Design an enzyme around this catalytic site. Structure first.
Site, PDB file in Angstrom:
ATOM      1  N   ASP A   1       0.858  -1.261   0.581  1.00 45.14           N
ATOM      2  CA  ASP A   1       0.359  -0.801   0.202  1.00 45.14           C
ATOM      3  C   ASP A   1       1.347   1.010  -0.026  1.00 45.14           C
ATOM      4  O   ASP A   1       1.311   1.870   0.027  1.00 45.14           O
ATOM      5  CB  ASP A   1      -0.761  -0.063   1.079  1.00 45.14           C
ATOM      6  CG  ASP A   1      -1.675  -1.418   1.259  1.00 45.14           C
ATOM      7  OD1 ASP A   1      -1.783  -2.072   0.555  1.00 45.14           O
ATOM      8  OD2 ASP A   1      -2.389  -1.300   1.990  1.00 45.14           O
TER       9      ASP A   1
ATOM     10  N   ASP B   1      -8.446  -3.879   2.741  1.00 44.11           N
ATOM     11  CA  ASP B   1      -8.400  -2.553   1.263  1.00 44.11           C
ATOM     12  C   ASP B   1      -9.576  -3.776   0.854  1.00 44.11           C
ATOM     13  O   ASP B   1     -10.731  -2.226   0.046  1.00 44.11           O
ATOM     14  CB  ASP B   1      -7.299  -2.748   1.033  1.00 44.11           C
ATOM     15  CG  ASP B   1      -6.139  -1.808   1.804  1.00 44.11           C
ATOM     16  OD1 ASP B   1      -6.794  -1.320   2.192  1.00 44.11           O
ATOM     17  OD2 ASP B   1      -5.013  -2.077   0.888  1.00 44.11           O
TER      18      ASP B   1
ATOM     19  N   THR C   1      -4.890   4.317  -3.003  1.00 43.42           N
ATOM     20  CA  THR C   1      -3.927   5.339  -2.428  1.00 43.42           C
ATOM     21  C   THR C   1      -2.673   5.917  -3.153  1.00 43.42           C
ATOM     22  O   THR C   1      -2.016   7.044  -3.319  1.00 43.42           O
ATOM     23  CB  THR C   1      -3.122   5.466  -1.199  1.00 43.42           C
ATOM     24  OG1 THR C   1      -2.619   3.492  -0.860  1.00 43.42           O
ATOM     25  CG2 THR C   1      -4.940   5.184  -0.143  1.00 43.42           C
ATOM     26  N   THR C   2      -2.189   4.339  -4.399  1.00 41.63           N
ATOM     27  CA  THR C   2      -1.126   4.242  -5.487  1.00 41.63           C
ATOM     28  C   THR C   2      -1.485   4.895  -6.298  1.00 41.63           C
ATOM     29  O   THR C   2      -1.019   6.463  -6.871  1.00 41.63           O
ATOM     30  CB  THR C   2      -0.437   2.843  -5.315  1.00 41.63           C
ATOM     31  OG1 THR C   2      -0.037   2.052  -4.365  1.00 41.63           O
ATOM     32  CG2 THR C   2       0.443   3.395  -6.270  1.00 41.63           C
TER      33      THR C   2
HETATM   34  N1  LIG Z   1      -6.914  -7.996 -12.985  1.00 40.73           N
HETATM   35  C1  LIG Z   1      -6.795  -6.874 -13.568  1.00 40.73           C
HETATM   36  N2  LIG Z   1      -6.495  -6.816 -15.192  1.00 40.73           N
HETATM   37  C2  LIG Z   1      -6.246  -5.094 -16.000  1.00 40.73           C
HETATM   38  N3  LIG Z   1      -6.207  -4.350 -15.107  1.00 40.73           N
HETATM   39  C3  LIG Z   1      -6.445  -4.512 -13.253  1.00 40.73           C
HETATM   40  C4  LIG Z   1      -6.812  -5.554 -13.223  1.00 40.73           C
HETATM   41  N4  LIG Z   1      -6.465  -5.404 -11.490  1.00 40.73           N
HETATM   42  C5  LIG Z   1      -5.742  -4.230 -11.124  1.00 40.73           C
HETATM   43  N5  LIG Z   1      -6.078  -3.481 -12.396  1.00 40.73           N
HETATM   44  C6  LIG Z   1      -6.145  -2.040 -12.142  1.00 40.73           C
HETATM   45  O1  LIG Z   1      -4.908  -1.106 -11.608  1.00 40.73           O
HETATM   46  C7  LIG Z   1      -5.612   0.030 -11.462  1.00 40.73           C
HETATM   47  C8  LIG Z   1      -5.199  -0.041 -10.000  1.00 40.73           C
HETATM   48  O2  LIG Z   1      -5.068  -1.312  -8.985  1.00 40.73           O
HETATM   49  P1  LIG Z   1      -5.404  -0.788  -7.147  1.00 40.73           P
HETATM   50  O3  LIG Z   1      -6.336  -2.082  -7.142  1.00 40.73           O
HETATM   51  O4  LIG Z   1      -6.027   0.758  -7.009  1.00 40.73           O
HETATM   52  O5  LIG Z   1      -4.500  -1.047  -7.370  1.00 40.73           O
HETATM   53  P2  LIG Z   1      -3.819   0.133  -5.311  1.00 40.73           P
HETATM   54  O6  LIG Z   1      -4.447  -0.454  -4.266  1.00 40.73           O
HETATM   55  O7  LIG Z   1      -1.998  -0.208  -5.823  1.00 40.73           O
HETATM   56  O8  LIG Z   1      -3.941   1.676  -6.163  1.00 40.73           O
HETATM   57  C9  LIG Z   1      -6.736   0.391 -11.705  1.00 40.73           C
HETATM   58  O9  LIG Z   1      -6.881   1.191 -12.664  1.00 40.73           O
HETATM   59  C10 LIG Z   1      -7.118  -0.968 -12.465  1.00 40.73           C
HETATM   60  O10 LIG Z   1      -7.770  -0.755 -13.508  1.00 40.73           O
END
Ligand SMILES: Nc1ncnc2c1ncn2[C@@H]1O[C@H](COP(=O)(O)OP(=O)(O)O)[C@@H](O)[C@H]1O
Ligand SMILES: Nc1ncnc2c1ncn2[C@@H]1O[C@H](COP(=O)(O)OP(=O)(O)O)[C@@H](O)[C@H]1O
Ligand SMILES: Nc1ncnc2c1ncn2[C@@H]1O[C@H](COP(=O)(O)OP(=O)(O)O)[C@@H](O)[C@H]1O
Ligand SMILES: Nc1ncnc2c1ncn2[C@@H]1O[C@H](COP(=O)(O)OP(=O)(O)O)[C@@H](O)[C@H]1O
Ligand SMILES: [Mg+2]
Ligand SMILES: [Mg+2]
Ligand SMILES: [Mg+2]
Lengths: 121, 50, 43, 518, 125, 96, 48, 191, 144
Positions: free
Chosen positions: D57, D384, D90-91
């Site tokens: 995170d 989360d 948050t990232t």
């Molecule tokens: N299985 C997946 N296939 C394609 N894109 C994904 C997948 N899982 C997540 N993403 C992309 O990753 C981005 C950020 O994911 P997130 O869960 O917010 O990561 P973090 O929690 O580190 O910010 C999202 O905008 C989403 O479009």
């Protein structure tokens, strides 16, 4: 209430200049310093807004001397009209008054200082 | 006259009553002017500089 | 207006102000040495 | 002249700016690798007590690392409050906020546009982005089957970046089943995280009822069928009487022995008041002394002591009853019932497992793993997930993920870029390139070509279709509805709104004043 | 207590919730000065148990006589006291700052009672 | 511990060979999952109590300590300690 | 038991038990009560 | 040099009478009048002597005003105890307060429940010992592992009072200096 | 000191028997199951024809360190001993391993070297999970 944004300042300024002319001696030069000191505020607004201070200051001095309407100032947002009736800007009289009173009353104290002793900590 | 003592607090004055009170005087002969200034300030309240 | 050129630089005008005050400081040192009412300077 | 003092760093309009942007670049490059499903986790080594922390995170990475830069402290605080609001994303705020400033650095230098003019483009660009984000959403919750499926897809999308990416097919059932058991109550305090060493990551099993780490008394039995549960926030300890200020004046020790007899008779009558209900267990908040403990033996009552404040509400909601302290009127305060009160052992610590309760409004996620660093990642990962799915219950609208939300928002921004006259239209396009940079980074972390997939995705969506997205497993464009990738509407709304405010604060700077440290 | 309902609406008449504001919390009464209560043989020990048990019964009857629905004190209520309010559908907030307590009475068009014996219908919120 | 460091040594040369770490990680999880199924076919079941297997297993499992040569009488002591607690459900016997 | 807060025994109580030929011990851990009770089959006592 | 000072410094008003026949009267009685005046000051300062079981409204006065005392900077030390009856260390510390209250009457001994002291303060954190003096917190002490924990004794508590400046080192009431009469009896025989 | 070692030593004896009463599986020791997993996966690896198969070859090669370490501690030549592990295992499907008393290869079931299956299961399982966590680390950043 009043209408600031250089308007107030420009008004005040031409007033002072006329009065300055009606004054002769060490006093006139002063009055002139008070006039040019008020002009720094709308020139600062013209400097921050990017407009030319020459055309801005010359337009306000020439226009306000001609017309008696005293609600035209420096348009900073870049509108086509400088009349502040349409731009929705209003300021209080007690607020704009205290800028001159607390400034001119402080500078009397600043100018009287001759001896300046600072004990190092 | 602008005076700033060791504790770093500004104190501006025109009369000589509090200017001499701020400056802690070591010399006894210079303390004579400080005593009459406080005495003039205590009795009358005018002419402390003169 | 918003389309005006900001020019991105305030350091040049600040350096010119530092030079003018530095130039006026030494100019005001020798101001009282002009005319018949001037004073000598022993260095 | 000198106006500030000794040991005071000051900067003016060329050292002030370009120190925040390089700080925005410095804080953004750290969290660049953590974004996406193929992102690498960052390890944090503490300066004292040799405490290590494995975490993905972005908020937790910025919590621990010290950052004396004032511009980086803005990114530290916005990730903190973003973790407080939603818990996930948050990232994306830190990356989008840094890239917005990276673009604005070029607009100030190359195009020579005022900073206030850049903000006015971002206000209209952000308004067009949120309007497209609102229209791109879709309703839900009318059919419980579709609402069940969308929470499974949101759990898969959330845990794809965490350590549970391989076992998200199993953890999605564990994540979504606990949320539906809440019965609409949005609160994370009703979910426990029990740390157990051993096993593997996929050994986490769904628990029926409620389980906690407590123990019976010294003399209590192992199994009681159909036990009535009671919860006392009482003091079965040395009660004293509460008019503090009572003392005992004693003329002779004959009545003092009878006085101590009255103290034992006082607590005996209090335990006799418990037996009027005919309960089978007794749960107390604080420690139970031995003399109350011996009295529950002959009456056939179990005893559990030293329950946490959160554990009272977590156990009471599953039981269905209410916390009782007076024990005066047996008419009200109807208690629940539990079938199996038998404890089990998972590792070296026994845990009291319940099963067959009236309601399951509180839950408990049992986790298994090798290292505590992995369990800490398991805690932050599901926290989360459960935080996003819990807020999805109250906020029903969702939006397609997989990078399509970023490009579909930039479509309306690019459409509204042409009809805006002046120099702020370039800043409106700079906002569009900032949205385009997120899927550019998703392809970089996966090791595939970014310019081709971004160009193919950008050209595909302008044709008229709006369901395409990035498939990083195959490395090509695919249908997001088939893969089942969807995220909440409030998440991306908070990210775009927070990133817009993030660039606005740091772009309105001209001087830096760093006073002397204490 | 977290088991209380979050949103509290009024019922059929008297749409005002009758917010009662209090300075003294739910506690045993005692004087400020130092004091030691001389406790005799078992007769006095059993008598004082009925004293405080009748005090809480007198306490809850006094609040229900006033008809309040929400009670706030600047200091925390006793435990037993937290449950006794929860039975009669009478939520409570505790530990409301002293400076914050005065502002609540002004908006609600009420006035703070000094003690519980002076509690009546006119001074409720 | 020994094995781990060994698999890290296997992953050391594989990082130079242009393979992603996630592909290397998933390969061990699939390989380890298959390793469990192989041992489930090889392992043989035992009775509830068997002194021939349990005593010999306890003695040959210590194998490194000071009491390994004293295991002629301590291995029955360990078997007799656990056999008093018996259950058909295969519970986790507490050592308290 | 240990009973740090209140005195476990004294010279007077030891003297009466010395005539009855009764041994006594102290410094028992609170966690070992399950082992002694379940092992020896003796229920604890907390009231005379 | 110290041999002359030990005649007066190392003897109280009860012990100074030993030197009535040996030492000069004017040398002895001049110091006895001094030590007698010091004893009278402690009697006037003995405003306390039992644990003040207080409540919060009052804290804002008892704990702090007292700490100012006369405000002659007549400061007064105020030992607060955030009691918690469920903890074992809290009941031990309550016994030390009443024992020390009977001896040190000039020092104020304050007790209050920890649940009533601070909003949602962690239960684990207490037993909490705070020491006020002239309105300022001299020591914010944590649970008694520093003072032995469960095995805390009266000697350890009295030693802590000397560190914070509440009691002098050579005070005759401290158990470290208050030697038993049988101890001094053996010293005189073996001398 | 040895009394403290004798405590944790008997703890291993109770825990090893605890593994047998909770799980009835029982396998041989002395380098027996390590060579069996490497042998069985070698036949399955060559038929896959992928980069995942190339990792499984290194998985089988690195798993042979347990009998190699036994050879070095006993002083025997590892290649000569491990060559006998390969020579006897194609026919001997189980209970073939190393015996330290005779310093050679023999049937471990006759010599009574047995261990639970849960011990070797947890070793292969926990080892793969630890490598999964270590390889995902990219940066070492100092923090508070
Ligand atoms: N299985 C997946 N296939 C394609 N894109 C994904 C997948 N899982 C997540 N993403 C992309 O990753 C981005 C950020 O994911 P997130 O869960 O917010 O990561 P973090 O929690 O580190 O910010 C999202 O905008 C989403 O479009
Ligand atoms: N939209 C506007 N149009 C014209 N003049 C404005 C506008 N907004 C602000 N001003 C002028 O600029 C001045 C800015 O004052 P402000 O900076 O808000 O107070 P302060 O200088 O105390 O921070 C005002 O006195 C007003 O006359
Ligand atoms: N308006 C005036 N015109 C002429 N002389 C003045 C005036 N006011 C004051 N003076 C004279 O100047 C001197 C001023 O004294 P000053 O130093 O100003 O006050 P103080 O003596 O109280 O410090 C006095 O001696 C007075 O005689
Ligand atoms: N008597 C024996 N002969 C041959 N090999 C043995 C014998 N006893 C143990 N081993 C082997 O030694 C290896 C390590 O066992 P050990 O050192 O006892 O592990 P731990 O001490 O961690 O429980 C096992 O894989 C087993 O095959
Ligand atoms: Mg004067
Ligand atoms: Mg995420
Ligand atoms: Mg072993």
């Amino acid at each position: 209430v009043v209408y600031g944004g250089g308007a107030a300042e420009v008004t005040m300024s031409l007033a002072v200049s006329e009065e300055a002319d009606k004054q002769r001696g060490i006093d006139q030069y002063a009055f002139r310093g008070f006039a040019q000191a008020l002009d720094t505020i709308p020139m600062t607004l013209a400097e921050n807004s990017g407009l030319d201070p020459i055309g801005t200051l010359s337009t306000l001095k020439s226009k306000q001397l001609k017309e008696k309407i005293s609600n035209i100032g420096v348009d900073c947002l870049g509108y086509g009209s400088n009349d502040m009736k349409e731009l929705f800007v209003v300021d209080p009289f007690i607020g704009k008054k205290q800028q001159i009173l607390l400034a001119t009353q402080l500078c009397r104290m600043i100018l009287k200082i001759d001896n300046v002793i600072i004990s190092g900590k | 006259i602008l005076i700033v003592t060791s504790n770093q607090k500004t104190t501006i004055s025109n009369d000589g009553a509090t200017i001499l009170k701020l400056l802690d005087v070591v010399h006894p002969a210079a303390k004579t002017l400080v005593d009459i200034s406080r005495a003039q300030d205590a009795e009358v309240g005018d002419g402390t500089t003169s | 207006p918003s389309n005006a050129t900001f020019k991105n630089k305030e350091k040049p005008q600040e350096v010119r102000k530092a030079n003018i005050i530095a130039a006026r400081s030494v100019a005001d040192a020798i101001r009282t040495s002009l005319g018949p009412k001037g004073m000598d300077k022993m260095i | 002249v000198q106006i500030f003092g000794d040991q005071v760093t000051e900067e003016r309009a060329e050292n002030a700016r370009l120190s925040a942007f390089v700080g925005a670049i410095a804080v953004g490059d750290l969290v660049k690798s953590t974004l996406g499903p193929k992102g690498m986790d960052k390890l944090l080594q503490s300066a004292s007590s040799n405490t290590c922390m494995v975490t993905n995170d972005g908020a937790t990475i910025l919590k621990s690392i010290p950052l004396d830069n004032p511009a980086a402290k803005v990114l530290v605080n916005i990730s903190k409050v973003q973790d407080d609001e939603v818990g996930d994303g948050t990232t994306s705020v830190t990356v989008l906020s840094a890239e917005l400033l990276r673009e604005a650095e070029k607009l100030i230098d190359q195009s020579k546009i005022h900073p206030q003019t850049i903000i006015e483009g971002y206000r209209l660009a952000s308004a067009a982005a949120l309007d497209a984000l609102t229209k791109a959403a879709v309703d839900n919750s009318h059919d419980k089957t579709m609402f069940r499926e969308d929470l499974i897809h949101i759990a898969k999308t959330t845990l794809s970046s965490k350590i549970l990416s391989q076992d998200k097919d199993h953890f999605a059932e564990l994540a979504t089943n606990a949320i539906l058991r809440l019965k609409g109550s949005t609160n994370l305090e009703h979910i426990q995280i029990i740390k157990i060493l051993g096993g593997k990551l996929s050994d986490s099993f769904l628990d029926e009822g409620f389980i906690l780490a407590k123990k019976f008394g010294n003399n209590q039995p192992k199994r009681i069928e159909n036990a009535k549960i009671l919860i006392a926030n009482t003091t079965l300890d040395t009660d004293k009487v509460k008019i503090f200020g009572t003392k005992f004046k004693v003329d002779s020790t004959a009545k003092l022995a009878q006085l101590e007899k009255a103290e034992r008779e006082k607590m005996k009558n209090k335990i006799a008041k418990i037996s009027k209900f005919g309960i089978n267990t007794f749960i107390n908040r604080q420690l139970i002394y031995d003399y109350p403990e011996q009295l529950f033996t002959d009456l056939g009552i179990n005893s559990i002591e030293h329950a946490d404040f959160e554990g009272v509400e977590r156990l009471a909601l599953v039981t269905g009853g209410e916390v009782v302290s007076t024990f005066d009127e047996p008419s009200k305060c109807k208690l629940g019932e539990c079938d199996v009160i038998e404890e089990i052992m998972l590792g070296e610590q026994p845990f009291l497992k319940f099963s067959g309760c009236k309601a399951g409004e509180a839950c408990t996620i049992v986790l298994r793993g090798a290292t505590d660093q992995t369990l800490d990642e398991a805690e932050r990962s599901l926290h989360d997930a459960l935080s996003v799915l819990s807020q999805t219950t109250k906020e029903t609208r969702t939006v397609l993920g997989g990078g399509c939300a970023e490009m579909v928002m930039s479509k309306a921004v690019d459409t509204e870029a042409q009809n805006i006259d002046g120099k702020k239209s370039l800043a409106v396009e700079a906002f569009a390139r900032a949205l385009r940079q997120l899927p550019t980074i998703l392809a970089d972390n996966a090791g595939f070509d970014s310019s081709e997939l971004v160009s193919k995705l950008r050209s595909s969506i302008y044709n008229g279709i709006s369901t395409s997205g990035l498939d990083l497993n195959n490395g090509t464009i695919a249908d997001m509805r088939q893969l089942g990738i969807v995220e909440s509407y409030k998440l991306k709304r908070a990210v775009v709104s927070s990133a817009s405010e993030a660039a606005e604060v740091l772009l309105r700077v001209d001087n830096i004043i760093r006073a002397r440290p204490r | 207590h977290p088991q209380m309902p979050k949103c509290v609406l009024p019922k059929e008449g008297s749409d005002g919730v009758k917010l009662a504001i209090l300075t003294c919390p739910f506690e045993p009464p005692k004087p400020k000065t130092k004091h030691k209560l001389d406790i005799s043989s078992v007769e006095e020990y059993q008598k004082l148990q009925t004293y405080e048990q009748d005090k809480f019964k007198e306490m809850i009857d006094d609040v229900k006589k006033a008809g309040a629905d929400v009670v706030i004190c600047q200091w925390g209520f006793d435990d037993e006291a937290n449950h006794l309010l929860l039975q009669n559908d009478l939520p409570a907030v505790r530990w409301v700052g002293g400076q914050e307590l005065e502002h609540i009475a002004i908006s609600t068009n009420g006035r703070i009672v000094p003690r519980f014996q002076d509690l009546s219908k006119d001074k409720l919120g | 511990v020994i094995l781990t460091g060994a698999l890290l040594g296997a992953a050391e040369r594989l990082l130079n060979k242009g393979i992603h770490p996630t592909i290397i990680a998933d390969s061990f999880q699939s390989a380890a999952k298959r390793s469990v199924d192989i041992l489930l076919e090889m392992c043989h079941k035992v009775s509830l109590s068997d002194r021939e297997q349990l005593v010999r297993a306890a003695s040959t499992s210590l194998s490194s300590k000071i009491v390994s040569q004293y295991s002629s009488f301590l291995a029955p002591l360990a078997v007799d300690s656990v056999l008093k607690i018996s259950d058909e459900n295969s519970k986790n016997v507490d050592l308290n | 038991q240990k009973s740090i807060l209140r005195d476990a025994v004294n010279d007077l109580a030891l003297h009466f038990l010395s005539k009855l030929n009764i041994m006594v011990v102290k410094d028992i851990e609170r966690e070992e009560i399950e082992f002694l009770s379940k092992g020896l089959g003796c229920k604890p006592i907390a009231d005379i | 040099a110290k041999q002359h000072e030990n005649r007066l410094e190392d003897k109280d008003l009860s012990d100074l009478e030993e030197l009535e026949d040996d030492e000069d009267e004017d040398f002895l009685e001049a110091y006895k009048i001094k030590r007698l005046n010091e004893i009278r000051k402690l009697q006037e300062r003995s405003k306390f002597g039992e644990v003040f079981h207080i409540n919060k409204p009052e804290y804002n006065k008892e704990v702090t005003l007292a700490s100012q005392g006369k405000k002659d900077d007549g400061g007064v030390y105020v030992f607060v105890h955030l009691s918690l009856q469920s903890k074992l260390q809290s009941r031990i510390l309550s016994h030390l307060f009443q024992s020390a209250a009977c001896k040190f009457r000039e020092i104020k001994f304050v007790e209050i429940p920890a649940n009533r002291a601070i909003e949602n303060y962690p239960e684990s954190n207490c037993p909490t010992l705070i020491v006020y003096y002239r309105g300022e917190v001299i020591k914010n002490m944590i649970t008694l592992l520093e003072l032995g924990g469960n095995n805390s004794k009266m000697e350890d508590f009295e030693d802590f009072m000397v560190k914070v400046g509440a009691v002098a080192e050579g005070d005759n009431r401290l158990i470290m200096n208050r030697d038993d009469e049988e101890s001094r009896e053996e010293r005189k025989l073996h001398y | 000191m040895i009394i403290d070692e004798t405590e944790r030593s008997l703890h291993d004896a109770l825990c090893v028997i605890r593994c047998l009463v909770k799980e009835r599986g029982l396998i041989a020791g002395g380098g027996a199951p390590e060579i069996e997993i490497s042998r069985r996966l070698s036949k399955e690896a060559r038929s896959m024809e992928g980069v995942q198969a190339f990792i499984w070859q290194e998985f089988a090669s690195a798993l042979e360190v347990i009998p190699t370490t036994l050879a070095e501690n006993a002083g025997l030549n590892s290649i000569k001993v491990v060559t006998e592990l390969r020579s006897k295992h194609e026919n001997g499907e189980l209970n073939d391993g190393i015996s330290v008393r005779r310093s050679g290869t023999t049937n471990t079931y006759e010599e009574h070297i047995l261990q639970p299956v849960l011990v070797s299961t947890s070793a292969i399982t926990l080892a793969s999970e630890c490598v999964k966590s270590i390889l995902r680390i990219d940066d070492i950043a100092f923090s508070r």
